[PDB]
Design a binder for this molecule. Structure first.
Ligand code: CLA
Ligand SMILES: *[C@H](C)[C@H]1/C(=C/c2[nH]c(/C=C3N=C(/C=C4\NC(=O)C(CC)=C4C)C(C)=C\3CCC(=O)O)c(CCC(=O)O)c2C)NC(=O)[C@@H]1C
Ligand SMILES: *[C@H](C)[C@H]1/C(=C/c2[nH]c(/C=C3N=C(/C=C4\NC(=O)C(CC)=C4C)C(C)=C\3CCC(=O)O)c(CCC(=O)O)c2C)NC(=O)[C@@H]1C
Ligand SMILES: *[C@H](C)[C@H]1/C(=C/c2[nH]c(/C=C3N=C(/C=C4\NC(=O)C(CC)=C4C)C(C)=C\3CCC(=O)O)c(CCC(=O)O)c2C)NC(=O)[C@@H]1C
Ligand SMILES: *[C@H](C)[C@H]1/C(=C/c2[nH]c(/C=C3N=C(/C=C4\NC(=O)C(CC)=C4C)C(C)=C\3CCC(=O)O)c(CCC(=O)O)c2C)NC(=O)[C@@H]1C
Ligand SMILES: *[C@H](C)[C@H]1/C(=C/c2[nH]c(/C=C3N=C(/C=C4\NC(=O)C(CC)=C4C)C(C)=C\3CCC(=O)O)c(CCC(=O)O)c2C)NC(=O)[C@@H]1C
Ligand SMILES: *[C@H](C)[C@H]1/C(=C/c2[nH]c(/C=C3N=C(/C=C4\NC(=O)C(CC)=C4C)C(C)=C\3CCC(=O)O)c(CCC(=O)O)c2C)NC(=O)[C@@H]1C
Ligand SMILES: CCC1=C(C)/C(=C/C2=NC(=C\c3[nH]c(/C=C4\NC(=O)[C@H](C)[C@H]4CC)c(C)c3CCC(=O)O)/C(CCC(=O)O)=C2C)NC1=O
Ligand SMILES: CCC1=C(C)/C(=C/C2=NC(=C\c3[nH]c(/C=C4\NC(=O)[C@H](C)[C@H]4CC)c(C)c3CCC(=O)O)/C(CCC(=O)O)=C2C)NC1=O
Ligand SMILES: CCC1=C(C)/C(=C/C2=NC(=C\c3[nH]c(/C=C4\NC(=O)[C@H](C)[C@H]4CC)c(C)c3CCC(=O)O)/C(CCC(=O)O)=C2C)NC1=O
Lengths: 48, 169, 37, 161, 160, 160, 46, 65, 161, 161, 160, 161
């Protein structure tokens, strides 16, 4: 039941919050790798 | 905590008097609005878990400094804490709306709130905007339910504004 | 809020009447005619 | 209580950027000097009570502090002054392994000046006491890590004065 | 008040106002014109109740008046009716509150430690408020004596 | 109900219940036959409600019936149709009790995370109760629609 | 093998790497000055 | 003198407050002077009380603590 | 605590059924007896220190248990007796005002039989105490509510003995 | 706590002799299999909210204990059963690193059975639920650690009965 | 053990073992073959090492050898020679357990109260195990001598 | 917690009478022997550490108890063995000064028989120790005072066996 969403139906002000999250999902993954503990991934994702 | 009835008790108890004509007409002025108080308090809690969600998305779409890494609403550790710390301002505004005065707001939420937020780095600034986005709104769901709105249903909200925010002028 | 896509239940149209998802979609209606032309 | 891992990431969190090449250059020295940090930590815990015995024998005994009138005359206060002198060896070794002096800011320098001005403890006798064991540990763990251990003692001694 | 007790239980459970706690406020404010008429009757006849409870106290228990008792004297009688003036005036405060808690935080919490210190028998005051209960139901109508007589009958068991 | 609010209040303060809640107890106990006009008109009209709301849910949000959803199989949909009348049972416990004490301790304390133990997500099941409110309040008469409407309204706030 | 402990100690420090150096730098506003920013961008044509 | 109590207290708030799970069905030794209060606290939370035996009582003494 | 409004609710959801008309015909009786129950809780509390004064003077004053040798003579425990007797009268009032004796099962009759037989407290005097308490309050609130008090005073002593 | 490390210590200590060949033969089989038991605890700690879903839906769901009249019917007891089943997973994995079921004696199976009697949950449904978590863990961790999983849930299965 | 101390802190904060903390076990299961190559050396060389370090101990403290001292005679050497044989068993138990904890459960927590009643000067057996430290480190490699010396230095600070 | 003055008084109060002349001689004989008892207890309190090494040196050392397999093997169990022996001496000096066997019920003999069975400590070496402890304290304080001390040590072993 998944379809890829179009940008024109979505909105440019709506997707500029969206695309920075995709860097932010791995920016905290790079933070947690050098932190040596996955707690910061596993606490900022619950209920997102 | 301290009702509009019980505030008028120790407005009269400390001088040692009975209930005169001014006591019998100011208290009747509270009771004629009591049907309008309670039915407004139902529809405020109609979608109160939605009402904080519509306000803070309208807050953070209005002040986008508080999302991008700046002041503290950055992670969901902050953001879901922000929605809870918003939700106390909605929930205690229901109590003083029923209680008449703002003395429930005076010694449950207001005392120490300048000193809790300063110890965390939480700004007092957009918190005033966060109550300013609710007090005008809260009035939308009172208006769409058909209850009149004005004198009160703000009596509580700007007492959370004029006493929390620091005096400039 | 919307941006459902092309199903039965976002637009109210079924698998037949198989264009009327593109009455209001401006861009994919152009891809209908250019594939048709 | 935030460490060198947290202070680097929170320097890049509020900037919003990734790990930039100056910070990994800081993080490389934090990770490559771990066997210096472990060897320093395992030897101070190897003789924790020898160091504080030689520390008070360096600078505190046979003063006026031990004579009556002084603030180490009863055997209550000699156990107190030697517990508190142990605490500046525990928390120095705690900030040694985390690499940041922010443990001492939260834990030990919160109400230290409030305590010692309420019992009338001589502060000027304490700032030479922790300076005395700065020599003793650096003679015990070596000149490399004693230079490293000497910063957190001097951060305590800066907050003490 | 009732509104004070309804908030402070819904707040202590970290909750909004209940549907079961909203109707008691709806029951409060539609009985608001009724309850304030009751306290106007007690304040409007407040000289009568203090006079005719003193006449039904002192005949009913005359050892506090006969000399060597506690309330003996031309002033000490007149300050005893000062003490019965207060436990009429608080009953007018509890009636407009709904709850009796403006007598709990004012007039009933520390009585057993103060009439012990004053030499007054505490049970002899409990014959007085029971006497002024009987005047106030004779003053009032049929249904409201179940209302205003209960606020006296809280205080009878709370003194003795 | 109102009576277990008062006894569990008055136990830890070691007191008898005062008149501020004894008037509040007696005011609930004169409204049983008013509340019993609401409780049977929910009762025999149960199966008219239970699929008029169930068709109302999937015409609003069809993902629980969509393949890969939650009630895509019939053994889940037979469970999920049962839970409506289970929620219609416990709401009618609340309108009879006039408070929150049955509707708390049966089907509300802890449901926010123990649907997450199952497959069913939270806020779609919030939409299931909200469409069940208008499926019941259209069947209810209007002057007693406003009494039973906060009991449906509490379940929306506590689940979301 | 299977060393009980690990790492090369290295020659020095970790002593004074504590002070970070960066151009923060400064605060071009970027958020709620957008309305103001648009006016300034709009003004540039002159 | 003290009562050797064997009681079991269901916590019955623990899923709201989401705390750690400690285990009841304890066997403790409650002294004499507060058992018109300590038993009451077990009675507030619905705690079943199995056996109460006074450990070293000498019951019905008039003096002697 | 199960209530009489809630035990009939607790009788239904264990079976998982809706409210039967025989359960409604139970419930419609208990709503209509509302004013008869709430007024007796007022006038019991109006002199609740006075009922326990007259109840102890019926069958416990001047007897051989009040004389020395018996276990209510010292005044250490006679003040702990009438305070223990006062809790019976207050828990009888909650048992009447709820309308179910489930309140007495969960917080009066939990371990009360064993803690009296340990102490050597006579149960036969306590049943003689609390039965004399019932005949005071049935003449105090009237015999219409006195048979309602008689369900719960004799739920205690039948459970205690 | 008594580890399998401390089992062969305390056995050899009360014998007074040393770590001979009969002692260290358990040690060499400990450390060869110790790498595999720490790999099972990694995959458990990521799926810890998921094994409780796959086990309850295997054994406990679609049953009569879920129906009214059953004990696991109301959502308070449904919540406080997944609490009491999450804890049975986590203390089982403490024995996976331990190699000794002594951890289950001290913290889990000390006074649990009398609490379940005084609360009245069915004991055989728990053993039906503990046996549900036997195979879904070994479906994730592999059957080689499933034999290592094969002991400590069966210690719960024998200890609770 | 290394397992048990890492369990009872992660249990005390009511979580699992976090995967930054599992690697103290993941490291030591590779080096468990190292420690059983270490423990076999010290046990076989023990009955060599006991008959000179006690004689090394008696040079710096000879008054315990003298009459009046607590080790006078050959029958008053097995109180002392077996005690250093008792202590090296706890050293080798501290080798195999990884951390220092079997000595805490066996050999340290009453030594101030034991040798006070036994009449033994307690500052000698710290010097006696200081004599144990200097010669046992010579029998191994320096990587083993640094690790096995750290268990000795807790037993130095045990009696000091 | 019942003195011999109070056990005269508590015997004189179940009767509810005044001080009989027969009860006067039961405390004048207490007041005769009291100046012995204060002088006895100070000689115990000086040599309280000299008693406990001697009783251990008569029966406990070089025996089956201090074997590698035994009760008092490790120095935590040896730490408790002098600690559990010190309370037998310390409570007896309260009992000798009171002149009562009462005080060692409320502090010593609550559960001490089954407490030694639950841990795995034999009673047979204990009754060989306190009876050895009775002889060294007999000649230390004199056999007239030790006859008063000897009866309470035999009250220990009656409860412990
Ligand atoms: C210029 C021509 C044109 C265009 C662009 C449209 C556009 C549209 N029509 Mg449409 N229509 C037209 C002419 C047109 N109409 C004419 C002339 C007819 C009469 C026959 C129809 C009858 C028609 C129906 C019956 C309805 C529409 C609908 C629609 C809408 C949805 C289309 C859809 O889902 O297709 C659906 C396509 C199919 C179901 C495929 C059917 C294929 C048929 C059966 C093939 C016929 C035989 C063919 C020649 C093959 C022979 C093979 C040989 C080997 C035997 C869309 C706006 C719907 C509407 O109102 O939505 C707004 C609607 O319900 N159309
Ligand atoms: C949708 C396909 C994409 C998307 C869009 C999106 N997200 C939000 C809102 C937020 N996103 C976050 C993100 C995070 N919080 C974290 O802690 C972490 C881990 C470091 C991440 C990635 C947060 C806190 C919010 C709320 C605050 C905000 O408004 O930004 C929106 C706005 C929703 C609204 O209008 O209310 C949108 C459109 N999120 C995704 O994951 C997809 C990439
Ligand atoms: C969100 C819209 C705003 C914001 C919120 C924010 N608050 C916190 C933390 C707290 N808020 C409180 C406030 C109260 N506690 C009370 O008891 C009462 C009276 C009922 C009030 C008003 C407290 C105590 C805290 C501390 C945490 C706690 O609750 O124990 C945070 C967390 C700060 C952090 O980064 O950790 C946040 C983000 N901040 C904003 O920017 C918005 C204006
Ligand atoms: C000893 C080298 C010096 C000294 C010690 C001394 N201290 C006290 C009393 C206290 N000392 C502390 C010390 C600390 N508290 C902390 O929380 C920390 C960080 C973790 C430290 C280092 C505290 C709290 C007290 C109050 C008592 C207590 O611990 O509960 C005394 C006794 C003072 C008195 O008047 O009784 C003494 C002698 N004083 C010296 O002279 C030495 C220089
Ligand atoms: C009257 C029939 C009984 C009685 C009355 C009496 N009272 C006093 C003196 C005082 N009484 C109070 C009591 C209150 N003050 C309050 O403010 C309130 C609550 C609103 C109460 C209940 C106080 C403070 C006094 C002190 C003097 C004063 O009023 O300022 C007396 C005088 C006692 C004396 O020894 O002089 C008397 C006689 N006493 C009786 O004997 C009657 C039973
Ligand atoms: C008085 C008329 C009768 C009587 C009373 C008496 N009871 C006690 C001792 C205790 N009573 C209880 C009872 C309760 N605990 C509760 O929590 C509740 C619910 C409200 C009840 C009813 C308990 C547990 C005790 C034991 C603890 C203790 O004794 O401190 C005594 C004291 C006996 C004594 O001191 O020896 C007395 C006198 N006994 C009588 O003679 C009357 C018949
Ligand atoms: C030594 C002569 C013999 C011996 C002693 C021994 N006792 C214990 C344990 C306990 N002893 C007590 C007794 C008391 N505790 C009190 O608080 C008081 C009153 C002040 C008394 C009389 C208790 C409660 C224990 C259990 C506590 C504990 O075990 O620490 C042990 C310890 C057993 C163990 O393995 O830990 C020992 C060794 N045992 C002998 O073998 C000697 C003959
Ligand atoms: C007494 C209070 C109480 C109730 C009512 C309750 C219900 C309950 N609902 C369940 C499942 C379910 N609930 C839903 C419901 C939905 N999915 C959607 O898209 C909709 C929004 C919603 C439709 C009504 C579905 C689809 C399942 C089956 C999921 C499964 O078991 O795999 C289950 C697990 C399996 C079962 O028994 O069916 C329980 C126990 N539990 C309780 O303790
Ligand atoms: C770490 C060791 C440990 C365990 C195992 C433990 C169990 C435990 N389970 C309990 C309750 C419970 N236990 C269950 C049991 C179950 N639910 C089901 O569906 C099954 C039949 C069964 C288990 C598979 C239920 C339903 C309750 C709630 C009882 C109630 O709320 O009245 C309680 C009472 C308080 C509470 O609810 O938390 C404890 C203490 N406690 C511990 O300290
Ligand atoms: C590891 C746990 C452990 C401890 C603590 C322990 C102590 C211990 N020390 C003992 C004797 C003794 N131990 C010593 C000690 C010494 N002799 C000296 O001169 C030196 C100063 C010192 C040792 C280097 C002495 C003097 C005695 C005899 C005491 C006496 O006869 O009064 C005995 C009685 C005889 C025996 O079984 O060995 C025990 C049980 N045994 C243990 O298994």
């Amino acid at each position: 039941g998944f379809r890829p969403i179009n940008v024109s139906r979505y909105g440019p002000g709506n997707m500029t919050k969206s695309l920075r999250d995709l860097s932010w999902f791995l920016r905290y993954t790079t933070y947690a790798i050098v932190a040596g503990d996955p707690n910061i991934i596993a606490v900022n994702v619950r209920g997102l | 905590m301290r009702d509009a009835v019980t505030s008028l008790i120790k407005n009269y108890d400390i001088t040692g008097r009975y209930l005169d004509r001014d006591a019998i007409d100011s208290l009747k002025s509270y009771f004629v609005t009591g049907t309008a108080r309670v039915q407004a308090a139902a529809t405020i809690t109609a979608n109160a878990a939605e009402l904080v969600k519509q306000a803070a998305s309208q807050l953070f779409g209005d002040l986008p400094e508080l999302i991008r890494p700046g002041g503290n609403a950055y992670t969901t550790r902050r953001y879901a804490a922000c929605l809870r710390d918003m939700d106390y301002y909605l929930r205690y505004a229901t109590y003083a709306l029923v209680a008449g005065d703002t003395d429930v707001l005076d010694e449950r939420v207001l005392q120490g709130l300048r000193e809790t937020y300063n110890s965390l780095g939480v700004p007092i600034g957009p918190t005033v905007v966060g109550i300013g986005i609710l007090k005008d709104l809260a009035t939308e769901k009172v208006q769409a339910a058909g209850i009149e709105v004005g004198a009160y249903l703000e009596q509580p909200f700007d007492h959370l504004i004029s006493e929390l925010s620091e005096t400039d002028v | 809020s919307y941006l459902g896509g092309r199903d039965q239940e976002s637009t109210g149209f079924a698998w037949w009447s198989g264009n009327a998802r593109l009455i209001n979609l401006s861009g994919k209606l152009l891809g209908a005619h250019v594939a048709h032309a | 209580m935030q460490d060198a891992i947290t202070s680097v990431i929170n320097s890049s969190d509020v900037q919003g950027k990734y790990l930039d090449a100056s910070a990994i250059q800081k993080l490389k020295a934090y990770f490559a000097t771990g066997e210096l940090r472990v060897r320093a930590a395992t030897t101070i815990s190897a003789n924790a009570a020898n160091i504080v015995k030689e520390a008070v024998a360096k600078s505190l005994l046979y003063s006026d502090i031990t004579r009556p009138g002084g603030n180490m005359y009863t055997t209550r206060r000699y156990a107190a002054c030697i517990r508190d002198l142990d605490y500046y060896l525990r928390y120095a070794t705690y900030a040694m392994l985390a690499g940041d002096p922010s443990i001492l800011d939260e834990r030990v320098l919160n109400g230290l000046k409030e305590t010692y001005n309420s019992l009338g403890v001589p502060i000027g006798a304490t700032v030479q006491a922790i300076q005395a064991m700065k020599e003793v540990t650096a003679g015990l763990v070596g000149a490399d890590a004693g230079k490293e251990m000497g910063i957190y003692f001097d951060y305590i001694c800066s907050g003490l004065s | 008040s009732i509104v004070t007790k309804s908030i402070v239980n819904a707040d202590a459970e970290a909750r909004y106002l209940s549907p079961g706690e909203l109707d008691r406020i709806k029951s409060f404010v539609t009985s608001g014109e009724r309850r304030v008429r009751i306290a106007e009757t007690m304040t409007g006849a407040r000289e009568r109740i203090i006079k005719e409870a003193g006449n039904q106290l002192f005949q009913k228990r005359p050892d506090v008046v006969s000399p060597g008792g506690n309330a003996y004297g031309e002033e000490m009688t007149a300050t005893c009716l000062r003490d019965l003036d207060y436990y009429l005036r608080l009953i007018t405060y509890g009636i407009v509150a709904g709850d009796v808690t403006p007598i709990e935080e004012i007039g009933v919490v520390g009585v057993r430690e103060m009439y012990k210190s004053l030499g007054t028998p505490i049970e002899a005051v409990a014959e007085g408020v029971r006497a002024m209960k009987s005047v106030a139901t004779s003053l009032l109508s049929g249904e409201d004596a179940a209302e205003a007589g209960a606020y006296f009958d809280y205080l009878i068991g709370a003194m003795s | 109900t109102v009576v277990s609010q008062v006894i569990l209040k008055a136990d830890d303060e070691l007191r008898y219940p005062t008149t501020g809640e004894l008037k509040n107890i007696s005011d609930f106990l004169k409204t049983g036959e008013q509340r019993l006009r609401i409780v049977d008109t929910l009762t025999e009209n149960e199966k008219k409600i239970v699929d008029r709301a169930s068709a109302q849910l999937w015409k609003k949000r069809p993902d629980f019936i969509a393949p890969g959803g939650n009630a895509a199989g019939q053994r889940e949909r037979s469970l999920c149709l049962r839970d409506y009348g289970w929620y219609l049972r416990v709401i009618t416990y609340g309108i009879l009790s006039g408070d929150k004490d049955p509707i708390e301790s049966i089907g509300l304390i802890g449901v926010k995370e123990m649907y997450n133990s199952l497959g069913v997500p939270m806020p779609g099941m919030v939409e299931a109760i909200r469409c069940l409110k208008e499926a019941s309040l259209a069947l209810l008469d209007d002057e007693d629609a406003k009494e039973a409407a906060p009991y449906f309204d509490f379940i929306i706030q506590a689940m979301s | 093998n299977g060393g009980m402990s690990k790492t090369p100690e290295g020659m020095t420090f970790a002593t004074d790497y504590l002070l970070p150096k960066s151009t923060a730098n400064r605060r071009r506003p970027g958020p709620n000055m957008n309305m103001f920013r648009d006016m300034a961008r709009q003004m540039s044509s002159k | 003198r003290s009562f050797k109590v064997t009681a079991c207290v269901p916590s019955q708030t623990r899923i709201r407050t989401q705390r750690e799970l400690q285990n009841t069905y304890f066997t403790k030794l409650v002294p004499y002077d507060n058992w018109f209060r300590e038993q009451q606290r077990i009675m507030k939370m619905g705690g079943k009380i199995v056996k109460v035996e006074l450990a070293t009582g000498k019951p019905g003494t008039n003096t002697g603590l």
